[model samples]
Target: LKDKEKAKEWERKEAERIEQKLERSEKEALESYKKDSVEISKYSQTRNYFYDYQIEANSREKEYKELRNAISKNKIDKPMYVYYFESPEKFAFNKVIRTENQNEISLEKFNEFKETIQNKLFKQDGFKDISLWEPGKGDEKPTPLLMHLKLPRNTGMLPYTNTNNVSTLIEQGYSIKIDKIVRIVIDGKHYIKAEASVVSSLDFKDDVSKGDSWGKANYNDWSNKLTPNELADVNDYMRGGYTAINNYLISNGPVNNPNPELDSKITNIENALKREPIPTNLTVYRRSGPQEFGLTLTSPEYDFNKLENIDAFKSKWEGQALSYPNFISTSIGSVNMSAFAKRKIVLRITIPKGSPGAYLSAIPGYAGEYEVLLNHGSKFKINKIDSYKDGTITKLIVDATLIP
Candidate 1:
């Protein structure tokens, strides 16, 4: 009876241990899910900025088209103005002569004036094609003795303070009257192009002041002074997302731990996540074929180490593939996919330094299916592998078939 009581006590202890283990696992799973959700939300927020910019660009493009139509129909007219440039005693730079009392400015002097002005204006940003003509030469109204400055397109509010010729002309005893001054409305395309360039060049340290100054000085007519910090924030988010994706691709797999470089990248991603708000539902997955295949896998909350086959890998994480064409484009310069027939697929693999020769050898002979994340969210199946060693690295030119 005493031995039976001891056996019951042992069974009770084992059941408690099992319960504790299950509780620990449940807690860990919940924590992982929360972390992944936060990361996904951060990525979405960053991606939204690009989408917003695109919308703004489209609106500007539409406005430009409408302005062009209005100009062609004469619903809106170009402004006429007289500008003066300093010349030598023998030469006089003038436009639109109203009376016979005025001296005729020589063609040589006028040509020189045109060339000088064109050269100066060309140096300034947003200054496009300009034409200077004497309205008096033709049978037209000779109201004021002025030069007709014809800007090819609208040049929104001209930055009089920053204009190169304005101060110079004023110093040279030239007329600087607000009434006489005219600025052409800028073309929407130029404004759009400038804004897009700014968006692409956004960095982490920039602020709203920089953006305001840039728009005011360069794209003077554009009213939207985008908050520089907002753009910078978006840039940081994008960089963070890219880093996360890269870490997943390179660090996560069958390996027990990440390398130093990869570990550093993961740390950066985590810090970025801390600064961001929690995400609703986040899921990312990356996996490589079995241990023999030199396969790789990475994700916020997925166990890819156990995945032994391509089919299983796809089934487990079907739609959560990371897409980054720009990363590939920058990494691989250019690719010529046209050389291969439609029936065959082309795979370009870049193996890092110090990779095993076995990893290089295993790809060619493998008849089983292979998958690569090339374009964002695109998966292709590999049918054959043709690899060559270039310098210190092995280049695997995988031939595959589109699974879809």
Candidate 2:
């Protein structure tokens, strides 16, 4: 009995010793990592601990070069007009329906209705009129509805998928607009297509202001007035929906090891993004692909040699409300430029949740406007009440265009 007790005590001691060793090792590694991170941050002035703009830029540049080369060698053509139909399923960014009463809806149901609309558009020629039913609305009579849609691009690519040749359409100024009431259908029973020519363009800035940039700006002159916290909040909100230019100074040192001997050997890369310190207002978006998406910019015509002063950049952006006003072009409809421009353009795309192309998994359906809420849990917490009226709202406007 004495021997058995001694053996059990020895086992307990061994388990305790092992646990202590593991805890000590974990603490040491964490401390080392933080020390290295701080040393590296001394040279680079990034606000976040995880971001390495220099490395990210280099990697993106290499990928861009490859994509651009493919474009040139493959000889892709520019697309004409990109189109959309009023459907709940495939590509419509927004939906409008009229009914006597409103009812609660789910994303799945919305998608199903949209899919049906798309099928109808594919089958009919200029099918103009459709009806819409609102939840709690009368079941017997559906209200007539009209929808604004884009004309699909001249490229042979259809709605379901695309050819690699037709992938870069974002630079050509191709965007869908809700111009005027064209048609309406309700419950798949009745249909109507408008004969009158609606206005050629619609100003989305009015209706879309609540969620998109133009509506969200605090003022035309936000510089010197906003706090870093506010700026960070805005950045977090805009991260997935749009691309904004960021310019800041950074220094660098060894990142993984905290040993003093290895610290000085790290080279500090300056201005690696190639963007000057001036705060420039740029508009950017992602181009859809078969499995993932690509990035696009307005144009690569900026004069890098003569950067606008920080104040000047701020003033220009503020006046424009930090919005892309020229989304529509009379000639091409939408601009679809390449994110792969060598030296001239850099793009950061927000990967959708569960996107196979993304390097990391993103929170599904979390791509929408909201104030940033950090340190909440396992994910980056975004305050649901601030920009978004409620936490449950999931839908966002994802614009579509064509590339030839």
Candidate with best TM-score? 2
Worst 10 residues of 1 by lDDT: 190-199
TM-score of 1: 0.17
- Structural similarity to truth (TM-score) of each candidate: 0.17, 0.19
Per-residue lDDT tens digits for candidate 2, residues 353-381, read 22111101112234432121111011111
1-404 per-residue lDDT for model 1 (tens digits): 11334433543453334325333433343233233433322222222112223424532333322322222322113432223221111012223321334334445544454432321111011111111222223223222222233222222211111112211000010111112222121211100000000001111111224433332343222112223443343234343455554545554431655466544443443332233211111111112222213333333212322323323433332222222211221111112222221211123222222211111011232221111112222243332232222223223323222222
- For each candidate, the alpha-carbon lDDT, in order, equals 0.25, 0.24
- True lDDT of residue 168, candidate 1: 8
Cα shift from native, residue 113, model 1 (Å): 77
Best by lDDT: 1
Worst 10 residues of 2 by lDDT: 380-389
Please give the RMSD to the true structure for each candidate, in Å. Answer: 33.7, 27.8
The regions of model 1 sitting more than 4 angstroms off are: 1-238, 245-346, 349-376, 392-394, 401-403
